[PDB]
Ligand SMILES: C[C@H]1O[C@H](O[C@H]2[C@H](O)[C@@H](O)[C@@H](O[C@H]3[C@H](O)[C@@H](O)[C@@H](O)O[C@@H]3CO)O[C@@H]2CO)[C@H](O)[C@@H](O)[C@@H]1N[C@H]1C=C(CO)[C@@H](O)[C@H](O)[C@H]1O
Ligand SMILES: *[C@@H]1O[C@H](CO)[C@@H](O[C@@H]2O[C@H](CO)[C@@H](O)[C@H](O)[C@H]2NC(C)=O)[C@H](O)[C@H]1NC(C)=O
Ligand SMILES: *[C@@H]1O[C@H](CO)[C@@H](O)[C@H](O)[C@H]1NC(C)=O
């Protein structure tokens with residue numbers, strides 16, 4: 001074969017002819033760098049035995065192992081293929097052991113399919129028998145999307161592999177990793193996935209979460225597809241320039257979904273329709289969050305809070321890290337250093353702010369009659385810990401408080417215990433949201449305080465290239481035992497089960513409210529429950545650059561509320577870096593400045609009351625808050641439809657191949673282009689301006705650039721923000737908290753396209769009740785402008801905000817002078833508004849107007 005198509009037969013060691021021969025593979029060392037010297041032969045694997053059988057849902061096939069050397073042990077002789085034409089755009093196939101039940105992910109959202117093959121498929125499936133392969137092609141153009149024929153199917157108990165050709169190199173996704181770029185390097189790269197507490201740095205290791213989804217943009221027409229593997233065992237994904245991708249996992253089953261869409265966004269919508277769309281956040285979670293590890297005392301925390309409030313920083317949320325606890329134990333506070341914590345909570349609340357508390361899964365096991373630790377006693381009484389391999393002894397590890405046991409969040413009763421612990425603590429400290437951390441789960445000892453037994457779970461025949469090369473490193477023994485199964489199988493599901501339990505707890509502690517959950521470890525579908533942050537980064541320019549692809553990727557995974565620690569967790573942050581990162585950070589969907597222990601303060605007001613950093617931070621945060629109605633509506637669409645929030649340029653501009661690798665800029669939704677300075681010393685940025693009309697956000701002037709690379713001038717106080725022609729942006733006068741800003745006058749920004757038309761929408765509900773979308777208690781309105789006329793149209797009208805909200809300002813960009821501006825209500829005029837016009841900038845602002853939110857209006861003008 002073409003060397004780019006070789007599928008490596010020796011993933012586990014340096015390639016030798018002797019091993020190649022024993023494995024029945026092909027040997028050819030004469031390739032280029034990273035081209036496998038030993039690769040699978042053309043007929044190695046499985047063949048279809050007999051006929052495929054039609055089922056109501058699709059078909060099944062029996063696959064029989066063609067005689068083969070047992071490399072990673074216990075091979076599976078009879079494999080069952082079950083294929084289901086689940087929807088017109090989603091294909092599901094699974095390969096199981098015909099004769100034995102194997103571990104399958106007990107996902108909380110995904111259900112087994114019952115019912116019949118879908119009509120009007122956008123795809124076709126083709127099965128080859130001798131040797132087995134499966135191919136999924138797009139019906140419209142016969143483009144081959146998934147094609148396993150490039151390599152073997154391998155299916156041993158602890159080694160399962162399938163490959164697929166890909167129709168392009170525009171591949172985005174997989175996680176959790178620092179990829180450094182957004183479009184994948186298809187040049188022989190292997191990405192291990194196994195939830196792990198480690199530093200998101202340049203080493204390309206497995207990190208906190210496990211995300212097997214990827215999306216492929218087929219060509220400039222926008223046609224795209226995506227693939228998801230429902231498997232929670234350690235795995236790695238191998239990318240090569242064929243182009244092709246190989247999944248290699250060490251247990252469970254190969255359970256694949258293939259999704260087709262007409263655009264990249266439609267693929268994401270299809271993926272999220274399957275795994276679970278993201279929670280609609282509390283509107284307050286959209287504001288700016290502040291945090292650090294080790295304020296040390298409530299006095300220190302209060303001083304930080306107070307200087308940022310004194311500076312009028314938009315600032316909704318304060319996080320309290322493990323320093324609030326009594327000796328780093330959950331569900332206590334330090335009665336000396338945090339004496340008066342409940343009074344401080346009241347102060348936060350009186351100022352319109354929210355408290356988010358960190359909670360760790362591990363529970364101190366140090367409790368006596370003399371000094372009881374309630375959470376451990378109650379947990380032991382309920383028998384809800386993760387056990388050792390004997391199945392009866394709670395496993396002992398070590399985390400922040402010292403020796404600890406670990407809750408088994410897969411046990412339904414564990415959620416009852418967890419809920420009661422939060423109820424009890426909420427009675428003392430009235431926190432508003434929960435930050436779940438260390439939930440990979442992270443262990444300061446490897447496996448347990450007594451290590452791990454040598455066995456096939458702790459020491460498997462094949463180990464993907466995870467950091468440190470052992471599964472149990474900085475986590476639990478793989479033979480530890482939980483309600484859903486052994487840690488070997490469910491390790492990647494710990495943070496997911498914990499988020500599910502935590503949301504369950506919120507039902508009791510925050511009745512009928514969304515609250516906020518922020519989680520470190522994630523699995524596919526975690527976004528239904530929680531926000532995410534990109535973990536323990538560093539105050540470097542590299543970390544700032546690497547943040548954007550990480551944010552875009554999590555939006556693909558349906559965790560749109562995601563961001564890094566702005567300014568950098570580890571290390572003292574330089575002023576210039578923190579200023580640039582604050583500017584960018586004002587536009588991360590989850591915007592939090594957080595800092596590690598002992599490092600110099602990096603909260604915005606710490607740089608000085610009159611500093612450039614503070615001024616610019618406040619400035620761009622005030623822009624974020626102004627655009628919160630737009631951001632919120634983008635979250636409404638992510639929740640209800642499955643759209644991304646932070647979005648790659650290529651999701652909107654896929655026709656333009658110059659956007660396919662852009663990862664130094666991004667969009668909010670379709671209409672706002674963010675262009676940060678990402679280089680030390682720079683007052684410029686080399687940026688791409690897509691094929692659209694664009695307007696400078698602050699001045700409203702139309703840029704001359706279109707569909708081209710530019711050097712954008714961005715001095716130390718600026719970040720690029722441009723509005724897309726053809727879009728209408730709802731705004732609301734900002735205040736330093738969202739409690740307050742939500743009572744303010746609204747505005748519209750109408751950015752006219754080349755045809756002097758534009759469209760937009762606004763979702764509005766109470767900002768905090770759970771299920772307002774499912775129960776249809778909300779306002780959705782639509783704005784459109786087509787020559788001389790803005791129409792405000794109400795499509796859903798079941799919530800009326802009691803604060804008398806109205807649009808009191810309309811700003812029109814790219815317009816000739818309007819004249820004779822008329823306002824009609826339900827067709828009835830209806831008042832002559834005030835119009836200000838800038839003939840140099842071609843901007844009109846209409847004021848002295850009061851268009852009540854929830855009412856239909858026409859605003860008309862002449863030229
Ligand atoms: C607070 C943090 O502590 C732990 O991580 C720290 C490591 O223990 C240190 O070894 C050091 O890591 C360095 C690596 O060893 C080195 O290989 C290189 O990559 O640089 C690293 C530093 O950049 O520093 C680590 C912290 O930077 C622990 O493993 C980690 O999970 C902890 N972070 C969480 C805990 C808290 C405190 O409640 C929160 O504040 C954080 O946001 C959590 O993410
Ligand atoms: C971990 O071990 C404990 C025992 O230490 C198991 O607790 C059992 O729980 C069931 C259901 O709650 C009770 O009916 C039994 O009486 C408990 N056994 C004992 C010996 O008390 C628990 O099931 C274990 N967890 C897992 C995942 O196996
Ligand atoms: C990679 O990891 C090592 C620890 O093994 C660390 O010291 C180093 O800084 C990392 N390198 C990069 C490029 O991030």
Ligand SMILES: *[C@@H]1O[C@H](CO)[C@@H](O)[C@H](O)[C@H]1NC(C)=O
Pocket residue numbers: 351352733734735736740741744
């Ligand atoms: C902003 O909120 C404060 C409460 O902190 C309130 O006093 C004030 O009236 C609000 N002002 C605005 C922006 O209209």
